[PDB]
Structure formats: structure tokens, C-alpha cells
């Protein structure tokens, strides 16, 4: 599609003050007649690169600066060129956050850092260390309350603890970030995440907590402390709670190191309204009046505009915000940050649920975050392919089939078994598409590949269930040219019955698990076998179809 000319469409996150921003849009409309529509779509940090790749999306994108280097690498952002007189109005270190390969790629707006937010009536003196928390929770639990509740789904909120003792993401070395040197599985990172997990085992915290539960809990007075940014202050103001904003507690004597973001506004490379966007951003938003309008909706943090920052700086909460920022670190804006964030997201969720151990989770996150080469994922995929064939060959009742029936079943189902193996093996599926017209279509199948793997994780499919699902997919009567289609149906039924008996015994509290598992199979067939070859095996086998290579193996011995 395309972007409309003569108006401005702006995307900003839903926890930010889009209504204050829309007020600035009304002022802009009043002076110029240009309609400004502010929108807060879900998962917009992912939506923007998808739609802007096709020449679509908003004119202006708002997000923390760490996602903008990736955007600029993909050509999605217009390079901004403010006059020196305008640049002088903003703090230089805010410009540094939005500079990428020497080019300013976004307007910085405000500096945001997580702080410890606490209820002063339930806790006049908040703990200075993370180690005091469990004793404080036991004391408060006997009064109908908890000590701490914060969002455990996003790694932003748990990183401060992980980093405190030594976790560090990408090392800054010789004036630039080193993608080879990642600090996600060092001793300090394991120490932090273990303490977090230990709080959950001991029922001081609940692994399911997200943003809504934590904010509701704190603002209703059920919990004494939370961890959040300045945007969250508005809703506490309107609520009954009388609260303070302070330094995050220390871990093992060291400060928590929050990842600091600079809320930034980038101009879509495909926008026909670049001058309008520049006009809006420089002359309307980045002003005392514009920023105040947004700040009264949801506080922005320490704003980049010097004139307005000098006033806000005197706020104790902004002082607390900058103290935590000064103890933590401004995020790199490099393209590899989204890989890092995704790696650490899955690591913390699995570790906090109890599924994986801390060491196992961070080990995987380390490889995933640290990968500027597809040679490893293509090697993993190549083995899963061999693993897949060898699995089928020894699967119960398969060796007794005629070889033509064995080949026919694998001809159809190999790609399905592969996807199941890739899900089971946590094959890292977030990387470039190795570079058309319907290319967009190709990219959608990549997302359907990713999304089905996620659904299998959220189902928490165990190894026994993966074994059954692979057999149900293998023994499919939908294969062509079977000598005894009825025989294969009864083989599929044995695997169906096996899965039924297993879940009925293993998950008696989920009576619909059997059906829910079978309901994942239609997405298995939708992943085309050509997509697997295109992504992993094209360099090795070129045009040759995997199906005929498998036929060779079966008839080789």
C-alpha cells in the first residue's frame, strides 16, 4: 500500500501519553489545517518494520532509541536534518542515542529509566537491597499484602537485576559495541536471574505477573512496591496510593543497572509528508508547551529539551529517574538489540516458570543473542533434517511398511516433522530473510513459521507429546499412492490413542489438551517444504528438492 499525503499519522506506544500528543496534533491542525491522527497499535515495534518494508505505515514512529538502528539499517527511516540552532535546544547525549553510522535518524524526546516505586503508607522506608525483600514480603503477607509486584513478561523490567552483578549484553570496546562479546550467560547474569527465580519458588512473586496485574495491584494498594517508568506515575496520581520514587535496590552490594531508553520519533522513509513531520516535531512537540501537553497526560521522564528539563529536573521523581539511569546504561541502538531482547525474553519466561533452569536458559540466550552468522542455524537445521529422517525410520510400525509407502509418507510429512523438531529444539527463527514482488508473501510464511512454533511453546508441549504428534503427522492417509491406506489409518489411530491416554493421565486438569494438540496440525501442513529449503538448505542442495534426497536415504540403508 501507500501513505496518505496532506496529513500526519503517528504511532506511539499505549503506555505513553497519546492523548496529550493528540492535543499537540490539534494545535498543529489549528495552525496549518493538517490532520494529525495519533494511534497506539499493539506490538508496534514489530508492526512498524513489517508495514514500512512495503512502503506503508505511519509518518512518524515513536519508540525508545534501541529499535531505530535496526530500522535505519533496513532503510525504513528518513535521515533528519535539523538546523544547528534547533539541535542546540536538545542535550547532546540525547542526540548521541539517535545517531547511527554518523546519521541522525530520529528526534530524541525524553530519557526514561525504571525506578523503584513504593507505597509510603505500607512502607515508609523502602529496602535498599534486593535481599531484604523476602523478609519484607513475609512480614507483609501476614497483613494481606505483598512486597513487590512488577511485570515479569518483559525483560526490560528484570534486566536491572540480571545486570547488577555482571550481566551486560554487548561490550562497548574501542568506541563501539562488540557483537562478538555478549554477557548474557556470565556468572553475574546467572546470579541475578537465580535470585529472581528464587523469589518465585518461595512465593514472594508470581511468574504470571505482567504489566496490568502489577499496575492494578500497586494502584489498589495490594502490594507495597513495583518497578516501572515515569509513564506509570499518572495512574498512581489518580489512584488512592501515596507513593514515592526511589533508587532501585542493590543486588550483592551493587546497584541495579536499568537499561536506559531515549523516547525518539523517527520519520518513515516512505512518507510524503517529511516536511510536515519535521514541522510538527521541531516546532510543535519539541517545545515547552508541546512537551508539557504530553507530560501532563503521561510523564515522559527527563526530556531532551533543555529549557523544559531544567524545571522538571527539580522533581524528586525525575531525580530518582536520573539516578537509576546514571547507575544503569543507555541502550545501544545497533540492529542486534532486537535479537538480544528476544533471546532474553524467552530466557526469563522459561526460567521464571520453572520449565528450564537458569543456566540452561541463559546458555541458549547467549548463542541466540550472539549470532551474526546463519552458518550455525543452518547447521542445526541440517541435523534436524537428518534427525527427522532417522526418527521416522525407527518410529513404531514404520520399518514394517513397504518402502514405497515409507517414501510416500515422508514425501508429504517430512516438513511437518521438521517443524515439530525445530520447535522442540528451539531452532532460532529470528534473522534476516536472506533477501521480488510476492516476496511479502514469502515473509508472511516466515511469520507463520515463527508463530506456530510460539504456539507450541505456549502449549508447553512435552517430549512425549512431540513423539505422538510426529507419529500422527507421519502416518497420514493424505499421502498419495499408499498401497494400504486403511493400514496407515489404523497406525495413525494407535498414535492418536497413545496421545489420548497420555494427556488424560499426565494432564487430568486439562480435559481438552488432546484436541488442542491436534488443532496445531493444520498449521504444520501450511508451512511449505519449499520454505524450509529456501531458509536453510538452498546453499547446500540448490534446486534439488529435499523429498528426493530423503527417498535416496530410505533406499540407501
Amino acid at each position: 500500500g501507500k501513505i496518505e499525503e496532506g496529513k500526519l499519522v503517528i504511532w506511539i506506544n499505549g503506555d505513553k501519553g497519546y492523548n496529550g500528543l493528540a492535543e499537540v496534533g490539534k494545535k498543529f491542525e489549528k495552525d496549518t489545517g493538517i490532520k494529525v491522527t495519533v494511534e497506539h497499535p499493539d506490538k508496534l515495534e514489530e508492526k512498524f518494520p513489517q508495514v514500512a518494508a512495503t512502503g506503508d505505515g505511519p509518518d512518524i514512529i515513536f519508540w525508545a532509541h534501541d529499535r531505530f538502528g535496526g530500522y535505519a539499517q533496513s532503510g525504513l527511516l528518513a535521515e533528519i536534518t535539523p538546523a544547528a540552532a534547533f539541535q542546540d535546544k536538545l542535550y547532546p547525549f540525547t542526540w548521541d542515542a539517535v545517531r547511527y553510522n554518523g546519521k541522525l535518524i530520529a528526534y530524541p524526546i525524553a530519557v526514561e529509566a525504571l525506578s523503584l516505586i513504593y507505597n509510603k503508607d505500607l512502607l515508609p522506608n523502602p529496602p535498599k537491597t534486593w535481599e531484604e525483600i523476602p523478609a519484607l514480603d513475609k512480614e507483609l503477607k501476614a497483613k494481606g499484602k505483598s512486597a513487590l509486584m512488577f511485570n515479569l513478561q518483559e525483560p526490560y523490567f528484570t534486566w536491572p537485576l540480571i545486570a547488577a552483578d555482571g550481566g551486560y549484553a554487548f561490550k562497548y570496546a574501542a568506541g563501539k559495541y562488540d557483537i562478538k562479546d555478549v554477557g548474557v550467560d556470565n556468572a553475574g547474569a546467572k546470579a541475578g536471574l537465580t535470585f529472581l527465580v528464587d523469589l518465585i519458588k518461595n512465593k514472594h512473586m508470581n511468574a504470571d505477573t505482567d504489566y496490568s496485574i502489577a499496575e492494578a495491584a500497586f494502584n489498589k494498594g495490594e502490594t507495597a512496591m513495583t518497578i516501572n517508568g515515569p509513564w506509570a506515575w499518572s495512574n498512581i496520581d489518580t489512584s488512592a496510593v501515596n507513593y514515592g520514587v526511589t533508587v532501585l535496590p542493590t543486588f550483592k552490594g551493587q546497584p541495579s543497572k536499568p537499561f536506559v531508553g531515549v523516547l525518539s520519533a523517527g520519520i518513515n522513509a516512505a512518507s510524503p509528508n517529511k516536511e510536515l513531520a519535521k514541522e510538527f516535531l521541531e516546532n510543535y512537540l519539541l517545545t515547552d508547551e508541546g512537551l508539557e501537553a504530553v507530560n501532563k497526560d503521561k510523564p515522559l521522564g527527563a526530556v531532551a529539551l533543555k529549557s523544559y528539563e531544567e524545571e522538571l529536573a527539580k522533581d524528586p521523581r525525575i531525580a530518582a529517574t536520573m539516578e537509576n539511569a546514571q547507575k544503569g546504561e543507555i541502550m545501544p541502538n545497533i540492529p542486534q538489540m532486537s535479537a538480544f531482547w528476544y533471546a532474553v525474553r524467552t530466557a526469563v519466561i522459561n526460567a521464571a516458570s520453572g520449565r528450564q533452569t537458569v543456566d540452561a536458559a541463559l546458555a541458549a540466550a547467549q548463542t541466540n543473542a550472539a549470532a551474526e552468522f546463519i552458518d550455525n542455524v543452518c547447521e542445526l537445521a541440517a541435523r534436524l533434517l537428518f534427525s527427522t529422517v532417522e526418527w521416522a525410520r525407527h518410529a513404531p510400525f514404520f520399518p514394517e511398511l513397504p518402502v514405497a509407502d515409507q517414501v510416500a509418507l515422508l514425501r508429504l510429512s517430512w516438513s511437518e516433522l521438521f517443524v515439530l523438531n525445530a520447535a522442540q529444539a528451539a531452532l532460532p527463527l529470528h534473522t534476516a530473510p536472506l533477501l521480488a514482488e510476492r516476496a511479502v508473501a514469502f515473509m508472511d510464511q516466515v511469520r507463520a513459521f515463527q508463530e506456530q512454533v510460539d504456539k507450541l511453546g505456549r502449549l508447553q508441549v512435552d517430549s512425549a507429546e512431540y513423539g505422538c504428534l510426529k507419529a500422527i503427522a507421519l502416518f497420514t492417509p493424505d499421502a498419495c499412492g499408499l498401497s494400504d491406506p486403511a493400514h496407515v489409518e489404523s497406525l495413525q489411530e494407535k498414535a492418536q490413542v497413545a496421545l489420548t491416554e497420555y494427556v488424560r493421565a499426565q494432564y487430568p486438569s486439562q480435559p481438552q489438551r488432546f484436541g488442542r494438540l491436534l488443532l496445531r496440525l493444520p498449521a504444520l501442513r501450511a508451512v511449505p517444504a519449499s520454505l524450509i529449503s529456501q531458509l536453510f538448505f538452498m546453499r547446500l542442495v540448490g534446486k534439488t528438492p529435499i523429498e528426493t534426497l530423503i527417498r535416496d536415504m530410505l533406499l540407501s540403508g
Binding site: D375, C378, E379, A382, R383, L385, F386, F537, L540, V541, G542, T544, T548, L549, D552, M553
Partner: peptide
């Protein structure tokens, strides 16, 4: 190192010499 990539390459070449 690139063990299973080379395994796949061999399968490729064998098939090619048919």
C-alpha cells in the same frame, strides 16, 4: 564443525552423479 551441512552436501553430490 559444519558436520551436517557437509553431510547434506554429500547427499547432494551423490544424487547428482546419479
Amino acid at each position: 564443525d559444519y558436520k551436517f551441512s557437509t553431510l547434506l552436501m554429500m547427499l547432494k553430490d551423490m544424487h547428482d552423479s546419479k
